[PDB]
Amino acid sequence: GSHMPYLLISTQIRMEVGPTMVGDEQSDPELMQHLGASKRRALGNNFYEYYVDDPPRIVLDKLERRGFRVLSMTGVGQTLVWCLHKE
Amino acid sequence: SHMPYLLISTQIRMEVGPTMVGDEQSDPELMQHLGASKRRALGNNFYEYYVDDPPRIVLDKLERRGFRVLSMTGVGQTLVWCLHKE
Amino acid sequence: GSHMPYLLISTQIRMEVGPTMVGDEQSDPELMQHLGASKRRALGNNFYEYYVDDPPRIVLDKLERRGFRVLSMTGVGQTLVWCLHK
Amino acid sequence: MPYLLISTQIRMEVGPTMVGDEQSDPELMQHLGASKRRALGNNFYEYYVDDPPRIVLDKLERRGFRVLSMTGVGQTLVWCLHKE
Amino acid sequence: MPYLLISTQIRMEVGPTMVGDEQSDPELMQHLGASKRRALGNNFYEYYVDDPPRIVLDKLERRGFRVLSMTGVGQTLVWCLHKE
Amino acid sequence: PRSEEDNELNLPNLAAAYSSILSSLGENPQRQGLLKTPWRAASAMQFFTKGYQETISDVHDEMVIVKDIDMFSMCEHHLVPFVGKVHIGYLPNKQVLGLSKLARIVEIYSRRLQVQERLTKQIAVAITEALRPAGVGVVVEATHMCMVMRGVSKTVTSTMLGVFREDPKTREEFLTLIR
Amino acid sequence: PRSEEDNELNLPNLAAAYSSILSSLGENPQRQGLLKTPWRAASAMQFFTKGYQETISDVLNDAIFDEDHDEMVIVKDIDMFSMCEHHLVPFVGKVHIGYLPNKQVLGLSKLARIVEIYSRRLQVQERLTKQIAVAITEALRPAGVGVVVEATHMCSKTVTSTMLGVFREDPKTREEFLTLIR
Amino acid sequence: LPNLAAAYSSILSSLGENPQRQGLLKTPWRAASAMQFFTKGYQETISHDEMVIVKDIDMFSMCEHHLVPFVGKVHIGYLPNKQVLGLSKLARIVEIYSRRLQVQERLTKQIAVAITEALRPAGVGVVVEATHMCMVMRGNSKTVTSTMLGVFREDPKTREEFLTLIR
Amino acid sequence: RPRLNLPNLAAAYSSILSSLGENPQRQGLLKTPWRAASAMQFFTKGYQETISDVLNDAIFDEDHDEMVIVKDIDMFSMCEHHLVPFVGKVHIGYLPNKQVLGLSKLARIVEIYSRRLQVQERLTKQIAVAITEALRPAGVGVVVEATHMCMVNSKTVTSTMLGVFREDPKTREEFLTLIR
Amino acid sequence: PRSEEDNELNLPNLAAAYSSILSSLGENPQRQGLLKTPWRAASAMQFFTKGYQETISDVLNDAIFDEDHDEMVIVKDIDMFSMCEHHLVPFVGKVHIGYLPNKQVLGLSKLARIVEIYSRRLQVQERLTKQIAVAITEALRPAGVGVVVEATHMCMVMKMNSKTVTSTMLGVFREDPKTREEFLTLIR
Amino acid sequence: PRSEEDNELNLPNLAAAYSSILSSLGENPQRQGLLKTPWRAASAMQFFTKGYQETISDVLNDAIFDEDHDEMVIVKDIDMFSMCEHHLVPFVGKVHIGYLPNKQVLGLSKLARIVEIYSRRLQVQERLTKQIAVAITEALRPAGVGVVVEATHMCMVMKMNSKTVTSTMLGVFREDPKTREEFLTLIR
Amino acid sequence: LPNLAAAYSSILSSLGENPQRQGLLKTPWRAASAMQFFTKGYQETISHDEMVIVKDIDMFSMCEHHLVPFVGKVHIGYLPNKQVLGLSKLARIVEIYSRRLQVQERLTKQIAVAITEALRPAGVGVVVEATHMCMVMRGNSKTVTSTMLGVFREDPKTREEFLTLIR
Amino acid sequence: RPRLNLPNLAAAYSSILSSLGENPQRQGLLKTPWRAASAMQFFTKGYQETISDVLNDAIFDEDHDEMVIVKDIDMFSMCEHHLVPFVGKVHIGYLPNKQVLGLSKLARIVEIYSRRLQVQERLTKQIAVAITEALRPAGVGVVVEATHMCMVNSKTVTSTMLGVFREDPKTREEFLTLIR
Ligand SMILES: Nc1nc2nc(SCc3ccc(F)cc3)[nH]c2c(=O)[nH]1
Ligand SMILES: Nc1nc2nc(SCc3ccc(F)cc3)[nH]c2c(=O)[nH]1
Ligand SMILES: Nc1nc2nc(SCc3ccc(F)cc3)[nH]c2c(=O)[nH]1
Ligand SMILES: Nc1nc2nc(SCc3ccc(F)cc3)[nH]c2c(=O)[nH]1
Ligand SMILES: Nc1nc2nc(SCc3ccc(F)cc3)[nH]c2c(=O)[nH]1
Ligand SMILES: Nc1nc2nc(SCc3ccc(F)cc3)[nH]c2c(=O)[nH]1
Ligand SMILES: Nc1nc2nc(SCc3ccc(F)cc3)[nH]c2c(=O)[nH]1
Ligand SMILES: Nc1nc2nc(SCc3ccc(F)cc3)[nH]c2c(=O)[nH]1
Ligand code: NA
Ligand code: NA
Ligand code: NA
Ligand code: NA
Ligand code: NA
Ligand SMILES: [Zn+2]
Ligand SMILES: [Zn+2]
Ligand SMILES: [Zn+2]
Ligand SMILES: [Zn+2]
Ligand SMILES: [Zn+2]
Ligand SMILES: [Zn+2]
Ligand SMILES: [Zn+2]
Ligand SMILES: [Zn+2]
């Protein structure tokens, strides 16, 4: 199907508030720029991430306008993760 | 669609409320329709919308507003539902 | 769509054995009676619940015959929860 | 009997996989190569196989079952299947 | 072989991603660039890649797989895929 | 707030009530050891409630804890002391509190006629409002004299807010570190 | 001694004084938490000074036993709650009592009853320590008595110690008592 | 006070630190006020038949050789002759002498001498237990000093009683 | 650049002795200006070192998949607000990736930052950041427990949890149990 | 492995080096207290490194028992004496071992014998911890193993109060929070 | 006394002897962990014996204070690290010192400096205990001195729980039962 | 009994000791009777909604590999379904299995299995802590064995509760 | 004369296994006759040594006027009445005249007498007599604390005080305080 069909986003609970993690080092830079995301290597991590201040509901609506749909949502530890897909 | 996604939640036990139905930027008309109240709980640096109803009742109300459950998950002691205008 | 479209059921692990929680105080009494459920307020709870002795697989098959389908299943703590829709 | 519940503890790459309760279809249990046992500390019988869950899932697909949901609860991975 | 299970520990942005057990399809494992190992403390072999799960998911989509479910179990994120 | 003028003005009324108590108990307020008691008991009770003279307005990604803060308070039901320790923890957002300032928060609320539950809440609420942090934890451990001078024990009250309530790792860390 | 009639009669006067104190402190005696406080504080202060309603003779009823034992008898860690006569704030702790009988022993609980009648009064720790030792010495005429009070004053720990008879004179006796009360 | 703040500002510069950074701007004044409070004892003047002991009296003093604190506890015992001292006054005696530039030995003696002269008792015992930062911040050791006067010195029973009861 | 001044320090301490109302000429106070100056230099000898100097012969390439902890490291620091000591202990834990640090070098890290005019929060962060940057480990835990003499019984505990020490409940629980 | 013949052959070379050290330190090797020191120090250093004389194979001869035991087995407070390989000064403490068997259990004393073979060498605590865990994992193929070493290093004390704790968690001791918590509670 | 020049001169001879020991034990002196060991062990052994570089005279420079103090002075829990002269293995523990002055007192830190000069040598606990007591007696001429050393000998542990306590009681600490009892109570 | 005494008399001779000296004359019989008492368990047969725990149950057993005692404590916990077991019967179960030639692992399992089969509870927890002379008299170590069944195995809250409450 | 017999011991232990009603052929009991025999030989290896062997390189002529104590010496003995262990600790003290004993040799003295079929009273006396005869000191103190397995919480304490440890109250008090 599409180039780069899957997307993983996350937030720590509480879900009503950000930050929302929206990407890894190899994420599409144009989509990251569209979401207003910033790239950082948080202290203690050996990898870069893209994040936004927005709560996940706002990011989900933006991704819908980019052709993404939520396939699955899960909890892991204190993290809420959404798996999205674009045709 | 306008504002297609919705997140709602409740703590265990699922048979009883409150059910969290929104954040500060939630649609005020939908919050009013659900009979929700806005509050900043002590210890939180954000406002939330909640109802006294258990989640089964909120889910039925959201179905009549055109929403469909896409996913349900547990995180800590919280049950979360992700809904989409379907 | 239908009157009371959503249903939440649960069991504690192990999933092979009951009880299975099948309702809250505002649950459809006819569906609760059909499942052979009993209403109780467990000590320590400030709410009534409907439960059956059956493991969840048996309740799921009964709900299928009532027009319900599983939309989602999740774990929260030691609880397995199923979200069904008619 | 449209619904089926199966499970495994972490790690998912290795069995046993729990495939049934006392009231499970004996022919499906026999087809999966399952054995019935009451593990020490349990007051119920279960059916299990040595296979990891991926192998059980492929076998259930050939019997007309489809995965509706998969979830974690404690250290257990559970799959809910429906006969299509 | 319609079903596939993959996993990663938190953080999801970084690998390794577990992509198979001893009985996994060797051609699919080779296609993903996976290596086989028996990690110390384990009594089973596993296939893994250095890639984060988002990259493995895109590769599996090009092999005809689709995510049916995603779940968390302890610190592990698991995806259940089906060849559809 | 209560002023030092209010204290001077009410000191003779307090001493008169304590002199009345000495005579109602069957004691002799004229004996050597009890002569200055009405004024010593009145000054002591004013000192034990000096927190009414203060207002809260007048007074990094890591968990900050100040543990074993000595606490002396007065039972409002029986007017007998309850004494112990306060352990405070918080995870700051953008502002931190001076280490001595939280002992000053424990002081303003504890030096009053109290119930341990209200005291614990007041400390947590004051820190939460002053700093708006990610979370706060307040644990008070005390011996109540109205329970010990009658047959029986320690009372422990615990307020967990924000991430101290929501995150099991955060709450466990705070409870381990305060031992 | 103070009677239960004196207590009933003086309870309203005590409650009135405690109501006056709540008002003089700047507090609101009408709030939920202080409504019953004049009566609760008055009843508590009567209970704390209940030692005035009993005499040493009442305590000694069925307390003496004629025995030929020849051994040191100790009752240690007796909980003690007294009231400071200077500030009307409690001083609390423990009393350790030892004695070497001559021809009479006391019932073990009666040693605690002696700590009770003197400590449940407006006191100074030194007088309390002496009163306990004097009461035991006079009730039994023993070869020796040791009384150690350890207390925290709500107004550092205060320890007072009375050593009489062979507890004062014999180094072996005093050392034995002090080791055994650990 | 300004002379003390000027010396602390000089120390801040001599150590290689920037006395203009946010965290150090008010340090010359705070250190000067702290050192005045630690030496507030220079502002004050000293003007039954049972063993009386007040143990675990908290003590904070300043080493006169290194100007680093020494902290710990004081245990006081006495056998009165005619007059007894109010419990709070024993701690006030501890306070006047400890809040000065001291050596633990002089501090211990000053407390014992003050009690002996105020009461003329049959005996006095003073034990100070302290941790010296001048020894710890250099490289677990504690200093214990003990003054035994009158019957506390002469009578083995009396001295043993005091030492057992202060534990 | 990292850290002559001894007579300037002694002169300031002699001035302090006089300003307090004490006679600097008495036997016990005669050598005090020099002893206090040498003590204050030793308490701030962390300004003479760099993290690079500490890391000489400190790194070892090893395949160790285990939690490494050095607990009860004595710590002596100076409050930057009042110039009075704050003393206690540091407990450090880390989960290595491909490099381990010499056990004594963890204490040397505590030494460089604590021997300065400090605030406990900054000190805790500096130790964790130095370990993280020297080894790039899967995670770090730093807990400092101290008594502040400016406050004159209460203890301050600061805790930094990074990487897997922050994210994994099992890892954080293991570290906190093992440091007791 | 090192043999008793290698020990006899190298004992005079060890004693000669220790005699040289006594002289190089400024001491008098002829005084009463130092007279036999070259030989006593050499024999002591051979004993401290006696682990090089053993193999994991001989330590595990008839140490294995086939049993159907589903329970956590722990041997805690095993005294441990090792030698720092960087400074040649001892590091001493305790080892706590836990494991969840499947088809085989090890004789309780054999777990201590494993601690002995690896600790009686020139070591670093991290390597010692790993070697014990690897030996147990390979000898039994259990569901999980936990190894915790707590030690005082004389090259760090000669600061003085500091202890080094190393911890290896494998299999279910790594994966299951309940298993790891159970082991850590039971060893304390 | 030993000088820093003697140390520089003997450091290569010490490193050569430690390199020889590494080879004689059956170890590989070329492996990563043993590479610098000859130099680290040599510098460590020089530091452990740094007491030979000092004299009691320089340790007591302006340590004496003429004072009229009639009280027992104790410094307890002084950390002590020494080296066994028979086996070249450490013995470690604590020293507790007490004294009753007459015309002179010693600076509290100087008592620890006395423990340092004698313990940082090849020793036997009995000699170390005596040397500390003799140094205090000679420096102050007090009414009495007490010295108690408590230590764990690594050549006895490598049984494991055993501690050695040595105690010197001089002057009034020997003669007066009240003085000796007071010191022994106050050090515990 | 005489066969046991004959073997103990043989052991006394094989050790290099004189079985005719005063202190050893009755030893073959005393050792034989002691070994019979230590193995008296071979003479016996096994035939609410709150956590119930009986902790610190004294335990004395015999190592089957070395014939030297292993001694310690047993801590038992269970969550009943319908029937509860009398407090003294839990110690009687401990007694039947411990008074035999054992290995701590088998002993732990036998106790847990006996409780599980007698009550069919929601869960059982059995922890044995013991000192083995076969390890101590050779060269501080303790052996801890732990069986967790039912909800004690599955539920982290239940297992944590039991382990905290047995301290 | 001080202490072939291993097969005779193994045969007796095999006989015991059978006489108890146990099957000697089960997996856990197969090597037991030999393991029990080797254990009982090790528990009685004190019969293989003489006090003269222990005193080799043990005496040192020294002018030490001090009390020397070795406390918490682990002790494992065998009851001669029931052949069940009695275990505990030994605390030894002495005041030398002109000779001191190597600290480890005091433990070796405990080892020779305790590794035999014993009664705690005889064991205590043998240790004190050996020290007295080897050094001729001004005094000796020997305290043995043990748990007897034949009794199956109660502890037995035996104490020998000789010379100045018996006569001088200051000496005895000093020893008893220092062994705690
Ligand atoms: N030591 C320690 N440090 C910690 N820092 C945190 S940040 C949590 C957080 C807060 C706000 C937010 F938006 C996202 C995440 N949590 C900690 C903890 O539990 N312990
Ligand atoms: N346990 C114990 N029993 C005791 N019986 C006595 S008889 C009085 C007596 C008379 C004269 C004398 F010189 C010493 C004691 N004194 C005892 C004691 O001190 N302890
Ligand atoms: N508790 C306690 N009370 C005590 N009262 C005394 S009066 C002794 C006395 C001794 C000598 C002298 F010239 C005059 C008076 N001594 C006591 C004691 O040692 N302990
Ligand atoms: N003892 C101990 N050892 C441990 N090693 C680890 S590796 C974590 C990890 C590494 C890579 C990855 F992909 C996922 C998780 N975690 C441990 C722990 O919590 N305790
Ligand atoms: N005491 C104790 N015994 C244990 N046995 C196991 S088997 C792994 C396993 C298998 C099945 C199951 F349902 C849960 C755990 N795990 C244990 C543990 O964590 N503690
Ligand atoms: N604390 C303490 N101080 C002490 N000062 C001395 S002077 C010797 C002496 C002189 C005169 C006298 F009457 C008794 C003792 N001995 C002391 C002691 O044993 N303890
Ligand atoms: N004190 C205490 N009482 C408790 N009662 C329970 S019933 C749980 C249960 C869990 C799973 C299941 F399938 C059926 C019943 N659990 C308890 C506990 O953990 N602690
Ligand atoms: N530490 C300590 N050292 C001691 N040295 C001795 S010599 C006794 C003696 C020797 C010769 C003599 F003529 C009279 C008394 N006794 C001591 C003691 O009790 N403690
Ligand atoms: Na969030
Ligand atoms: Na709810
Ligand atoms: Na269930
Ligand atoms: Na599995
Ligand atoms: Na990952
Ligand atoms: Zn009350
Ligand atoms: Zn008072
Ligand atoms: Zn100093
Ligand atoms: Zn400060
Ligand atoms: Zn080293
Ligand atoms: Zn030695
Ligand atoms: Zn054995
Ligand atoms: Zn016996």
Numbering used by the authors:
A (entry chain F): -2 to 84
B (entry chain J): -1 to 84
C (entry chain I): -2 to 83
D (entry chain H), E (entry chain G): 1 to 84
F (entry chain E): 58 to 116, 126 to 218, 223 to 249
G (entry chain A): 58 to 212, 223 to 249
H (entry chain B), L (entry chain B): 68 to 114, 126 to 217, 222 to 249
I (entry chain D), M (entry chain D): 57 to 59, 66 to 214, 222 to 249
Q: What does the published report state?
A:
Guanosine triphosphate (GTP) cyclohydrolase I (GCH1) (EC:3.5.4.16) catalyzes the conversion of GTP to dihydroneopterin triphosphate (H2NTP). This reaction is the first and rate-limiting step involved in the de novo synthesis of tetrahydrobiopterin (BH4). The effects of GFRP on GCH1 occur via formation of heteromeric protein complexes between GCH1 and GFRP, which are dependent on the intracellular concentrations of the effector molecules phenylalanine or BH4. GCH1−GFRP complexes consist of one GCH1 decamer flanked by two pentameric GFRP complexes.
In the presence of GFRP, the inhibitory effect of BH4 is boosted and occurs at lower, physiologically relevant BH4 concentrations. It stabilizes the active or inactive conformations of the GCH1 decamer by direct GFRP−GCH1 interactions and by enhancing the binding affinity of allosteric inhibitors. In the presence of GFRP, the Ki of allosteric inhibitors is decreased by a factor of 10 (16).
